[PDB]
Structure formats: C-alpha cells, structure tokens
Design a protein around this ligand. Structure first.
Ligand SMILES: CN(C)c1cc(CN)ccn1
Lengths: 156, 39
C-alpha cells in the first residue's frame, strides 16, 4: 500500500457509489484520523491492510500501524491553516485565527470553518507545516454555524 | 470496507484564502466524545 507522508481521503464503497466519510494524516508510517470516521474498523491501502493500533472515543482519535505521532500544539496567538479535503473536491488551504473552547479541564483552540461531515480528520497546521490537530469534532452555535475543536493526541 | 487515497502534501500555503472568526465558547465534553455548549 501507499505509505508516503501526506493527507488522505477515507472512502467507503458500502453505500451508493464511492463515498468519502473522512480524511487523515500519514506521518512516520502511522495513519491518524478521527474515531467517528472509521469507528475503529481496519482500512485498505491498495492491496495492503492498516490495522488500528490506538484509539479513544472521548478524544475522538484513532491511529493505525503505530502509536499517535502528532505532537505539535497551537501557540495560542498565531493564525493557522485548515488543509481542508472536501468530498469530490481538491485539497485546499484556509487560513484562520482560532477561537477557544473553554472547558472545566482547560482551554482548547477551535476553528470556525464550516465544511461537509466527510471533511472530518482534515489536518490543521502551524506556519512550519506541522499538524497541530485534526478538524471535525465540534459544536453548532446559536446562529447554526459550526466551530470545530483543534483535536490533538498525545505522543507517548 | 474502507480504503484510503492520497489527496496531497501537508504544507503551509503562502497567501492562502484567509477567513473565519475566533469565538470564545464555554463547552462541555461528554464520555461519548460529544462537545456541547454551556449556557
Ligand atoms: C463534522 N463536520 C465537519 C460538520 C458537522 C456538522 C454538524 N452540524 C456540520 C458541518 N460539518
């Protein structure tokens, strides 16, 4: 299968035609996506198979072939880019200044950008091109707009 | 059966389209991984 670093679409042929259910990041031989995209199922990459290695429903994250490798964090001040990969459309970078999710367990960066559900798992980057989290787990606020957390895992 | 297909490189694009606001929200995270608004 293809193990080149980069952003990938996660597809399924179970429904009508070929449907994009999400997106993920290949880095250091490990595939990273959100748990709600795959529900922890195995994935295919050409003729090869990717088996889950770690996952957590509460963080809404899952890694395949190895442990979670992404450890960069939003600095709390700078603009970032969502490398959005929408269903049936080309990868596109969108720059934005994150807002904040304030929780009883601390603050998390959040991006106020609205893309289809199939874009979940698209990476959010800093100015060095490092992945600071994945887009796709968030909330719908008063005016009906979507705000995603910047969801990042822990590198053991 | 789920499969993956390469979509691109991960790089910062100089002069990308700049949009979106920066809301400061009070939220709660439940055991199922769902975020909700705290009012
Ligand atoms: C999971 N994503 C990206 C969503 C979710 C919603 C749910 N209102 C709307 C738009 N995008």
């Amino acid at each position: 299968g293809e193990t080149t670093d980069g952003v990938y679409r996660v597809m399924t042929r179970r429904l009508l035609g070929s449907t994009q259910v999400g997106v993920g990041v290949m880095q250091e031989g490990v595939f990273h996506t959100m748990w709600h995209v795959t529900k922890g199922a195995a994935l295919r990459s050409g003729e090869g198979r990717l088996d889950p290695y770690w996952g957590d429903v509460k963080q809404d994250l899952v890694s395949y072939c190895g442990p979670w490798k992404l450890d960069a964090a939003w600095d709390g001040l700078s603009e970032v880019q969502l490398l959005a990969v929408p269903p049936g459309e080309r990868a596109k970078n969108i720059q934005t200044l994150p807002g904040i999710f304030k929780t009883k367990d601390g603050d998390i960066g959040a991006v106020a950008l609205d893309y289809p559900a199939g874009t979940s798992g698209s990476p959010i980057l800093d100015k060095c091109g490092r992945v600071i989290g994945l887009y796709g787990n968030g909330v719908v606020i008063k005016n009906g707009s979507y705000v995603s957390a910047i969801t990042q895992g822990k590198r053991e | 059966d789920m499969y993956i297909e390469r979509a691109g490189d991960i790089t910062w694009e100089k002069d990308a389209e700049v949009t979106g606001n920066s809301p400061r929200l009070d939220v709660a995270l439940d055991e199922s991984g769902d975020f909700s608004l705290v009012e």
